[PDB]
Amino acid sequence: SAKAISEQTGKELLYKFICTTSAIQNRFKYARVTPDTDWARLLQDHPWLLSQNLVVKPDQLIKRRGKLGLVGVNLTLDGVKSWLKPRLGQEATVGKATGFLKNFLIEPFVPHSQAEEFYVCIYATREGDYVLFHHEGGVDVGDVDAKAQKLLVGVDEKLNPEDIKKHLLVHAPEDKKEILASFISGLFNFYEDLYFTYLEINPLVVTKDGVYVLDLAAKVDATADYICKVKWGDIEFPPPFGREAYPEEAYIADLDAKSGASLKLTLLNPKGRIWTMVAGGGASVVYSDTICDLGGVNELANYGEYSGAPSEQQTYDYAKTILSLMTREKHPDGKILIIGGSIANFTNVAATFKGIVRAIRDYQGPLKEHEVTIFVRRGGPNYQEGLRVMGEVGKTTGIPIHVFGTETHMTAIVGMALGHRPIPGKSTTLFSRHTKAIVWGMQTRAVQGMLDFDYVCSRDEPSVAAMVYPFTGDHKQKFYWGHKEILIPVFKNMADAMRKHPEVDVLINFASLRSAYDSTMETMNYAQIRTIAIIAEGIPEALTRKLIKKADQKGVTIIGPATVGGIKPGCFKIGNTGGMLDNILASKLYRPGSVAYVSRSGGMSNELNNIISRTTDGVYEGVAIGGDRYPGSTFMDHVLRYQDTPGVKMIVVLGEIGGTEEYKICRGIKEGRLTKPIVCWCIGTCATQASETAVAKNQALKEAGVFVPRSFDELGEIIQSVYEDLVANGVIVPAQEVPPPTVPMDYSWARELGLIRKPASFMTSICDERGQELIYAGMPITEVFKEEMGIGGVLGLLWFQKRLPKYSCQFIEMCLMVTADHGPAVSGAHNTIICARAGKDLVSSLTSGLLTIGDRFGGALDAAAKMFSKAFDSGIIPMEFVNKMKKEGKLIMGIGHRVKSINNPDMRVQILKDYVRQHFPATPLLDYALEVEKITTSKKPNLILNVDGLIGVAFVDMLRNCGSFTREEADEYIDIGALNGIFVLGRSMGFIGHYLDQKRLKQGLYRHPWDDISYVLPEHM
Amino acid sequence: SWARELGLIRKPASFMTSICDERGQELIYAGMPITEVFKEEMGIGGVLGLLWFQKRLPKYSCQFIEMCLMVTADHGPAVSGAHNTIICARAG
Ligand SMILES: CC(C)(COP(=O)(O)OP(=O)(O)OC[C@H]1O[C@@H](n2cnc3c(N)ncnc32)[C@H](O)[C@@H]1OP(=O)(O)O)[C@@H](O)C(=O)NCCC(=O)NCCS
Predict the structure, then answer these.
(1) Which of A639, A266, A375, A952 is nearest to A622 (CA)?
(2) Is residue A1003 within 8 angstroms of chain B, CB to CB?
(3) Which one of A522, A575, A776, A803 has the minimum C-beta count within 10 Å?
(4) What is the C-alpha separation between A203 and A215, in angstroms, rounded?
(5) Count of CB atoms within 10 A of residue A433's CB?
(6) Where does this protein reside within or beyond the cell (chain A)?
(7) Is residue A562 in contact with ligand 1, taking CB distance under 6 Å?
(8) CATH code (residue A406)
(9) Which residues of A fall within a CB distance of 8 Å from B77?
């Protein structure tokens, strides 16, 4: 899409990026005045208004400003102020469009003669670039394309200055011929390496002083933004001059601008009764065409669309806006809502219809105030159930909703909404049954659709031989052939894919817009690839022109960019064309017919498949050439391809407004090149160049011998009429329909629409990862960091699924801080160091040390809590518990230190103990353990509470003594093993620290000397 | 299970496993049943040839694999992994 630029921005980059020796004068000398400014700031920051005289212009892309009286010529500064006083911010009409004027540009006026103002322009065409010069300047040139000097510089060639000094300036004064030529050459260096499309200087004010631009007109290719973001910068694309945008149009523009889908809405008149909400671009163009040709010219309220599969919230907002905009006032004949569309490819109809019923059932009252009637037509994946949903919403809410499927014509519902009808060398055989493909990209859904198409077409071998994905190694992907599973090799380089597969004669290029050019250029130097399909939407037009010229040099057939692909029923299908198998089997695309078709956009090829299925014996072949401006194959490269093939008996072409391509089809009829019956229609008349309108194309096609209907509603009728007349002389022999080999459907599709039930494993009452936020136990991660809970809080959430109080989380953190490292001598730290010195990695070292936390090392946490809990809940005093554990062996776990005894406390038992005494209500098991401590410190001086015993008993007090745990949760967490987890998670910090320490000291492999071992082996076994 | 027993739903499978079919009436190794494993008189080197390489190795190569497993057995308790196993076993 090459669209216009503001002229301030045009001369901005023109002064910024020209490269020629001719002096462009008045550089960086422009001003912009708005109704949203005062004058003094740009008065003092632009001192050069204080020196020269001025010329002012409206900066809103206004066509022909001279004869309409909008330019102020040769006026001084305060004179410009009094000239701009009744003009800046007031209404004006140009052409047939009105509006306010909010932008004006001031430029230093130059005194000159009208005899040496000149005209130059460079515009883009398909076969190259046209550079046109004319010596008669000014706006009074008139007819420019018959008298001016034109030169077409080809694609992939550089301008010679000798050709422009020979051919272009032939009617120019020679005193200025050596200057401007270099300037024009420099401007071509501005035209090409800034990715322009259309650029006029009219007039080019060149004097003896130098060169000057006064007026510019440029359409630039925005899709090359990824090439020019470092060179354009903050570039704005203005709208055309028309009426002021409504705030709801601005809201739909904002919702399109934040989202990835395509949302469009433009009102024709706000008090119309025919409101349309169509899914599809060419579909909505055809619906608005059929409305404006069936008498609904005046009260067609809007045209807009929702496509690219929008979300539920996005289509709810779109349907909310379009339902509110027809609520404001009432119309005595009643209002009509047309929710139409063509056959969708992969979109579930029920999701978008769930958005629509969320808008409708919330707006049921105000919609049945204004006497509305809703007509719905749909098709695609799961359309019948969505039609049933919106019909039952119409039946409960009382609003009349007439749902329709693929058995109706597409635009019949606006014929019966308005009451006009009742309410009920290049090859010629591209694809074959032995065609093998190579797919560029990770597109397993498209490859699986191609294999499913091959299975339902009774084919022997898959269409896809390999895939090419450069971001991973050579492996195999698992795909389905009916019921059986096959493997398709995924290669990394394309040369590896071509060496293993010499029978591949088509490549499907699913690359992005910025990497399809390099992939296609690297593809075209392989001689086995005879045809390429480019899928990407938005390849800039110079790059696809280079692709066209190398394809024409090499002789390969590019199915053009921005296409869905092409489908030849019975043999081959490109990627995702057709859609799911519901659309392939519903439109009978598994057996060959005798009708070919060519479309431009892809969204209408589904409806053409449906029309040729329901009126004719079927499609033989069908190719969408693409929505780009310069497709890799036009209409003619495929109509010559169909005219030479003997299998097809009639051709159908659906064109678009714009471009004189169908007149070549007329010319091919009048010379006798095309003999087979042609049925054309150029969609989108809607006139509410003059040879590029669809009514002129339809008129010149209807006169040349092409069966052209009166509207789109009669297209299936005229195809059926030509078909029955072409059977009537006996050249089409319809074969009797064989049933296709059926497939099992899918698991994901049958569970997405919810008709299969599977029992699940892994019940996980922890950490919902699905959704928009990571939820912990029941609390989102933003609430985790907002409620200011630390690592003790998230251990409370992950381990216990409970929001612990703020002292218990800090106690958990304190326990993780004291159960960290305890030196390298101990058993697990030793194993981690022996592992780290063997050079392993962090996980194996930590893991080899962690797998010693058992009963003897690290198991006093859980045992010293089970023992004291089984003693305290049995109901014996401590002086009997010590003697009970004295008559059985088995020392009290959690009692005793080897050094820190009494009058010498352990000082990490003490920090914990004064935490549990202060911030911690009702601690009976710690009091019991301290009474056992009082009894045992009388026996020995070094029998104190361990840290491994005090954390155990204080953690049982933490569980059963605060809130949140009853007593069977609190004992289950003490039985399952949530106290081993405290030691393991604490000691993992020390073990990772030991690993990093032995990696930082760079120690070698450990060997453990033989005089510490004392081998005690048997004599001779 | 009922829709896949009568075969009207299709699910792509993971875990492609070119080794050890446990389903059926016999345990099949690489391609060879367990009764053929013990009937052809292949030892532990034969079943390493079947499980690891999916190939029926010749009778000297299986015996060489067994010989390598016999010499790459223990090399005393001083070495690093034997040390870690003993520190782990003494921690009970
Ligand atoms: C299908 C389609 C969207 C292709 O998808 P795509 O955008 O190419 O998806 P990809 O995964 O290939 O693109 C990923 C991009 O992000 C980049 N990327 C991906 N992962 C990345 C990572 N981890 N780090 C950095 N960059 C990464 C890649 O570089 C790639 O862009 P580049 O290769 O051009 O640089 C497009 O071809 C299409 O729309 N086709 C159909 C056209 C249509 O609908 N028209 C029919 C009617 S006209």
Answers:
(1) A639
(2) no
(3) A522
(4) 6
(5) 15
(6) Cytoplasm, Cytosol
(7) yes
(8) 3.40.50.261
(9) 1008, 1013
